[PDB]
Design a protein around this nucleic acid. Structure first.
Ligand code: ATP
Ligand code: K
Ligand code: K
Ligand code: K
Ligand code: K
Ligand code: K
Ligand code: K
Ligand code: K
Ligand code: K
Ligand code: K
Ligand code: MG
Ligand code: MG
Ligand code: MG
Ligand code: MG
Ligand code: MG
Ligand code: MG
Ligand code: MG
Ligand code: MG
Ligand code: MG
Lengths: 124, 50, 402, 119
RNA sequence: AAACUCCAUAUAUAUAAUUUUAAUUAUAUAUAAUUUUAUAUUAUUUAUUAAUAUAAAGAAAGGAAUUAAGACAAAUCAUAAUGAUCCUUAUAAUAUGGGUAAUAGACGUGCUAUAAUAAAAUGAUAAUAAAAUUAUAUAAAAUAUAUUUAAUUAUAUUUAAUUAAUAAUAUAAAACAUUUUAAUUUUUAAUAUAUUUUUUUAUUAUAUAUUAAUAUGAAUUAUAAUCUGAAAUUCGAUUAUAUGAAA
């Protein structure tokens, strides 16, 4: 038989997904809201100083034009600012598919559902 | 509603190319700051889109 | 020379501040700031009045790195949760001693500028210390006064006294007749060699005359003590004493100045430090009951346990080293009953108003106006600004070319 | 130009930095103590000094071991090494490194400067 | 041979009484791709086709190992081992000290630097890592001195915890913000001035030399102190004050 069980929102209406980039990992909680984001309990502008990192986090929501329709509670650890910001980006994209599985094709086409494989390679 | 909306562009190709040419040693943030500050000064003297 | 009369030779932050780049901005007609009619300007972008702009420029209310050059003159959003809330407490609270806090770039300086604008309208005398670092960095002269037992800073005091004279209405200053007779040494280059001293008799001369006394650098500390005493004894005019970037004072207990034993001088051994903390602690009491003391912190300064403990946000930890905890400042702040007012972040509706003003000012890029729905822009800029930070909002709009 | 004990200084030069730059034997720490002792504020510049203050600097500088006196102490310590016949003294005489440096390569600065009558 | 593999990656199951906590993890087992399908175009050996694009599905994009033959009679008798030949009161063995660190020139490989798209300070409810190490140990916090309120840095005193998913080495750093920065009169100061006030403008003073070495650079050298060791002279490391070369 198959090993895939339909993903569904939890008891509090939250979609939980994990993402990885380089050495970083991110676990995000997406719920329907008004665009409030918290990264490790801190404001987005506090945790991520680079605007390009903030723009990466927003991109999946910008693809489905739902930037003001969800509250994101992102928790990230490991690597640096870029790995964490893009790991959160990847995790938000995977968590948005539960709210509307018809938008998976658009998320895949934008490239936010593809796990970036590049990592530091020991010189050979 | 989304079927007829083009996927928004991840980045500007020209600005990204200019930024990487300015950048050295992987210090992209400094390169982006220099370009953004320069383009901010162009807007403040021409009052057009830099 | 390599530098021509109009060449932009400074760095970017100073060029934007000093290069007069607002000249090309488009004149817009905005309502005027008036707290007595806030109902008509609440949640709307307003310019200041002509009388307020003149006073606030002389006080140093507007600072560099505030994107003021984008607009013809500096503008402010009259907010309900920040501007209206704070100004109502200032008019009602009996103590009227506040310290404005909040995350870096949240708008603490703009709030203080709106309190200065209110004071100008409400016929008050404003004493502002915009950049306390100037009397703590050791870049101006200092001298020890035996009669005051304090280190006076003549160069700094000369600038401060002129700011108090040029920023405040002469009529208010003239109304305050002097309570004591004062004698100073004459430094006026016209009659200095004819008149050894200049006398200010009581009930005849005013505080306006006192602020125009040209004295020698060694007697300028005694002139600052007279001005403060005269303003603290009179009950006619309320005195609003303000200090921006007060976090610098709390975190720099020892100035860069060194005494004759090569020992750094404690900040409370300077007249500026002693005077500032005497007004905050309550040692210097003002007769008028509408006098206030509004302090504001800045995110450019380091943080430590001093301010949080003084505000009651954390318990006192006695084993914290003095470099991260100054118990003397905590005692002074708690003796003055200073209360905290945290500036809240912007809500999405306030972001909408600011972005609608920016569109009319022609400061928005073409990628945010053409092919983008207005609702999408507001949602995106509210997300990219950290859910309300005004400074991150402006940067996302005018300083993000990626 | 401000002249202190013969040395000439450009007006804009910071006093604490200028003193440690033109006077042999005075470094950053020593210069700061002189300025602190004379009541000069940390970032005061030479053009600001008055003639009474220029004389005060010369007085404090004349009560220290600087210039010839300081240079003589080094020349006399080096001469003592040669007089006692220590290995280090011979290195100074031969214009060779005196602190264990290899000589198969490099050793160019020791060749130009190592000498009994060291500058 | 290639593949079949192993690693990485994605997913599933199992394990943890979720205080050895990182469950955003650990590591056992299993699955997955050497991707697949549809359509148009251009070529073809024109058909059940390749090159292309377009659409759809997908996390899927990278690596290692994987053996046969020959040559240079290429390196190694100094990792150890073998034959021949030579030494056997010495070409074997031990101790003390010295040398391998010498210095004309030359060569290879590195480090640091020659300033403003770049260096220096400061950033305590402490921005953000990974992989390793600790019974022939890793050493916390505190205190004392350099040394100044304190911090920082170095060492001493003392020796908490941990022989470890537990405690320690160890608050990563750059980043980012503020301040500062010679050449540079592009500065600073004294007056006056301003609706640029951390700032503008005006008038005076602010040097001379100068193709040049500064508040760049840190070689060389003096003195004092410290660390390891039984021992730091030839010939070790660190710190402070002073010295400040070439570039
Ligand atoms: N009410 C407002 N209306 C318009 N602009 C505002 C308002 N409040 C803040 N801003 C803008 O936000 C930016 C930051 O404002 P401000 O300097 O007052 O912040 P701050 O918290 O005092 O900053 P810091 O922590 O650096 O001292 C500026 O560009 C300012 O013009
Ligand atoms: K010197
Ligand atoms: K040697
Ligand atoms: K060599
Ligand atoms: K856990
Ligand atoms: K040896
Ligand atoms: K540099
Ligand atoms: K770390
Ligand atoms: K030099
Ligand atoms: K030795
Ligand atoms: Mg501020
Ligand atoms: Mg050979
Ligand atoms: Mg050798
Ligand atoms: Mg941390
Ligand atoms: Mg310790
Ligand atoms: Mg840190
Ligand atoms: Mg740093
Ligand atoms: Mg240097
Ligand atoms: Mg040269």
């Amino acid at each position: 038989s198959n090993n895939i069980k339909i993903k569904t929102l939890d008891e509090f209406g939250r979609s939980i997904a994990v993402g990885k980039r380089k050495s970083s990992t991110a676990k995000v909680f997406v719920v329907r809201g008004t665009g409030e984001i918290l990264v490790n309990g801190r404001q987005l502008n506090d945790y991520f100083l680079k605007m390009k990192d903030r723009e990466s986090i927003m991109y999946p929501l910008q693809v489905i034009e739902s930037v003001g329709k969800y509250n994101i509670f992102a928790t990230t650890s490991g690597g640096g600012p870029t790995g964490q910001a893009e790991s959160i980006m990847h995790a938000i994209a995977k968590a948005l598919v539960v709210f509307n599985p018809l938008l998976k094709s658009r998320l895949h086409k934008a490239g936010v559902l593809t796990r970036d494989y590049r990592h530091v390679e020991r010189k050979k | 509603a989304l079927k007829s909306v083009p996927i928004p562009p991840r980045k500007n190709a020209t600005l990204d190319h200019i930024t990487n040419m300015i950048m050295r040693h992987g210090k992209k943030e400094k390169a982006q700051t220099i370009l953004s500050r320069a383009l901010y000064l162009v807007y403040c003297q021409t009052r057009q889109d830099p | 020379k390599r530098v021509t009369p109009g060449s932009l030779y400074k760095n970017w932050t100073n060029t934007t501040h000093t290069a007069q780049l607002q000249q090309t901005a488009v004149p817009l007609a905005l309502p005027i700031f008036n707290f007595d009619d806030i109902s008509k300007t609440l949640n709307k972008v307003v310019s200041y009045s002509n009388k307020q702009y003149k006073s606030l420029h002389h006080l140093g209310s507007f600072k560099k790195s505030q994107f003021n050059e984008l607009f013809q003159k500096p503008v402010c959003l009259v907010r309900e949760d920040a501007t209206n809330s704070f100004l109502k407490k200032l008019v009602s609270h009996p103590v009227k001693k506040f310290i404005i806090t909040g995350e870096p770039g949240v708008g603490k300086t703009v709030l203080l500028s709106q309190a200065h604008a209110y004071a100008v309208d409400s016929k008050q005398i404003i004493i502002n210390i915009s950049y306390p670092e100037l009397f703590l960095n050791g870049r101006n002269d200092f001298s020890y006064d035996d009669d005051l037992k304090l280190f006076i800073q003549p160069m700094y005091l000369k600038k401060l006294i002129r700011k108090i004279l040029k920023a405040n209405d002469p009529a208010l200053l003239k109304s305050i007749e002097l309570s004591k007779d004062y004698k100073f040494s004459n430094a006026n280059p016209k009659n200095a060699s004819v008149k050894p001293f200049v006398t200010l008799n009581k009930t005849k001369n005013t505080v306006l005359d006192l602020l125009s006394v040209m004295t020698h650098p060694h007697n300028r500390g005694k002139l600052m003590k007279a001005i403060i005493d005269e303003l603290s004894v009179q009950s006619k005019v309320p005195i609003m004493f303000t200090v921006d970037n007060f976090s610098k004072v709390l975190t720099t207990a020892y100035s860069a100045y060194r005494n004759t034993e090569n020992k750094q001088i404690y900040s409370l051994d300077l007249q500026m430090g002693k005077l500032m903390m005497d007004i905050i602690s309550g040692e210097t009491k003002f007769a008028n009951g509408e006098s206030s003391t509004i302090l504001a912190i800045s995110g450019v300064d380091r943080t430590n346990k001093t301010l949080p403990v003084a505000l009651g946000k954390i318990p006192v930890d006695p084993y914290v080293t003095r470099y991260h905890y100054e118990p003397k400042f905590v005692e002074l702040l708690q003796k003055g009953n200073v209360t905290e007012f945290e500036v809240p972040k912007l809500n999405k509706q306030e972001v909408n108003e600011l972005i609608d003003y920016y569109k009319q000012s022609n400061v928005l890029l073409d990628k945010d106006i053409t092919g983008k729905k207005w609702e999408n822009l507001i949602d995106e800029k509210y997300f990219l600004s950290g859910n309300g930070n005004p400074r991150e909002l402006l940067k996302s709009l005018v300083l993000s070319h990626r | 130009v401000v002249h202190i004990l013969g040395k000439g200084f450009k007006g804009k030069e910071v006093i604490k930095i200028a003193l440690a730059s033109k006077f042999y034997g005075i470094g950053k720490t020593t210069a700061e103590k002189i300025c602190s002792k004379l009541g000069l504020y940390p970032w005061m510049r030479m053009h600001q000094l008055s003639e009474p203050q220029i004389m005060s600097i010369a007085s404090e500088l004349s009560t220290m071991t600087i210039e010839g006196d300081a240079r003589a102490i080094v020349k006399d310590n080096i001469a003592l090494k040669r007089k006692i016949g220590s290995y280090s003294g011979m290195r100074h005489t031969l214009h060779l490194p005196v602190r264990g440096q290899h000589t198969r390569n490099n050793a160019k600065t020791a060749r130009k400067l190592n000498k009994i009558d060291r500058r």
